[PDB]
Amino acid sequence: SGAIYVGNYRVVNRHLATHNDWANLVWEDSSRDLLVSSTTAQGCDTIARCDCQTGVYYCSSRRKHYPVSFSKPSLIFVEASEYYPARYQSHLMLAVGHSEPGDCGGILRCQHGVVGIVSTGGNGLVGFADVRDLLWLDEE
Numbered sequence: 001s002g003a004i005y006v007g008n009y010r011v012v013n014r015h016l017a018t019h020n021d022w023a024n025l026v027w028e029d030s031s032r033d034l035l036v037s038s039t040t041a042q043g044c045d046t047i048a049r050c051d052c053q054t055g056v057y058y059c060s061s062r063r064k065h066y067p068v069s070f071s072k073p074s075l076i077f078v079e080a081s082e083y084y085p086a087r088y089q090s091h092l093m094l095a096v097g098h099s100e101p102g103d104c105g106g107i108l109r110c111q112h113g114v115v116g117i118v119s120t121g122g123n124g125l126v127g128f129a130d131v132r133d134l135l136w137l138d139e140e
């Protein structure tokens with residue numbers, strides 16, 4: 001589990017969104033596994049606006065943050081899971097690292113701020129849903 005709290009937005013994996021998230025919906029995209037809902041309180045996270053390919057992510061199944069090198073956001077075939085059939089997920093970045101299903105939501109960050117959240121995994125890989133192109137998270 002896990003979310004990004006920036007401004008009056010909450011960014012979560014679409015497959016982990018709650019009824020309150022759907023009832024206060026700002027934007028959602030199944031092909032990216034992302035959903036954004038509105039919040040009453042202002043958050044403290046800031047979004048990275050860069051093309052870094054190195055950063056650090058939180059892994060809840062190890063209670064640890066790991067440094068990683070990750071690929072640029074792209075269209076990748078992801079195997080079937082409990083939440084989606086096997087399909088192409090867009091804006092996904094891959095790294096070598098530990099991830100279990102419940103690790104979804106962990107933040108990936110670089111020197112500039114939050115880059116994305118854990119979305120996929122398996123066999124020593126971890127995939128992150130990028131948020132650096134969502135410029136509207138910084139305003140309104």
Ligand SMILES: COc1ccccc1CC(=O)N1CCO[C@@H](C(N)=O)C1
Pocket residue numbers: 015033078081082083084089099100101102103104118119120121122123
């Ligand atoms: C954290 O992912 C792991 C890790 C190890 C093994 C399996 C998973 C589960 C997984 O790949 N999912 C969860 C549901 O959403 C899927 C998606 N975003 O397409 C991806």
Ligand SMILES: [Zn+2]
Pocket residue numbers: 048049050051052110111112113
């Ligand atoms: Zn950066």
